[PDB]
Amino acid sequence: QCVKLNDGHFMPVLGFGTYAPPEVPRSKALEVTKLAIEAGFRHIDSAHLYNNEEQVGLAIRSKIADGSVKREDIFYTSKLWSTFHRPELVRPALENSLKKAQLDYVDLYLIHSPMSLKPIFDIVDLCTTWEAMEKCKDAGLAKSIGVSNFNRRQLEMILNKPGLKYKPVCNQVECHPYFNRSKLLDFCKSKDIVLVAYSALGSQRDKRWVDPNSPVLLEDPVLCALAKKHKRTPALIALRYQLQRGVVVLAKSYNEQRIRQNVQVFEFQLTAEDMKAIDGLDRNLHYFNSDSFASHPNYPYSD
């Protein structure tokens, strides 16, 4: 199914995450994005940062070419990287992501992060960045625009901007049973802003930003015990948890079996008691936990 965004467009509630670390051959993104679409994924999450937009757009275009899907059946997101926050850089950055993917438009374009970088940190009025995203939606380059990694105060800045034309349709943030974002989720729902969860499965645990001593979400005993009760898997429990909270959830897998497993999230449900047990896992744990973000003046978790 799909959720209706506050601008009238529609977002599929389960999305495929395309990020893989640079040790993975660029060509794997092409193969696993085709598998994801074959499996039933219709929402595809990419970013300038991921260095995979050529491969991901080819996968989408290839699945249009063989008649498996139409362009309008695919929801494709890209993101503005943080060295392009200056308003004059936003449109060219988007047109580059479009040229790489070879698409006429993205369904969704996000400010990837509030933590601006020199075009070394930068100081940018993100309200001006936002005005330039608005113009991109006006131009038809992005169907919808939104933000990623914004905390409540940074989102309020956008929402209270003098002469705002379009609300962010979404805030894409770290969100999973260890860090379930209940308060931010409530705030978003009160503004008809969709919360989209990334690292919903515990993150890739990349050693550059994630402490390998952090607990492994998918080994959690409550998730395991739920997975055994429903005869599903811990990953599926964690994904279904978000859908029943009204969260759009991403899932990265470069594995053929797992990509196909993840679509099973539509095939079952959890009870109130299951949901309450999962909500009781919350421990304020963001897996991305690095000096590279934490020392930034607009670090979202400075809270």
Ligand SMILES: NC(=O)c1ccc[n+]([C@@H]2O[C@H](COP(=O)([O-])OP(=O)(O)OC[C@H]3O[C@@H](n4cnc5c(N)ncnc54)[C@H](OP(=O)(O)O)[C@@H]3O)[C@@H](O)[C@H]2O)c1
């Ligand atoms: N906006 C941002 O700042 C931001 C930040 C992080 C992520 N994201 C987006 O969100 C996407 C997903 O988040 P993430 O990359 O942190 O990964 P994730 O979705 O939390 O997945 C973590 C690991 O879960 C494994 N997995 C997938 N399905 C599984 C299953 N059924 N059972 C067991 N393990 C399974 C995957 O390993 P395998 O590949 O081996 O299956 C994956 O590497 C990202 O790729 C990117 O598209 C955005």
Ligand SMILES: CC1=C(CC(=O)O)c2cc(F)ccc2/C1=C\c1ccc([S@](C)=O)cc1
């Ligand atoms: C892999 C990665 C992600 C995850 C994703 O989007 O899937 C990410 C998300 C952000 F909001 C910001 C940075 C990153 C990132 C790599 C990265 C980290 C620090 C820097 S610099 C040293 O500040 C540059 C790049």
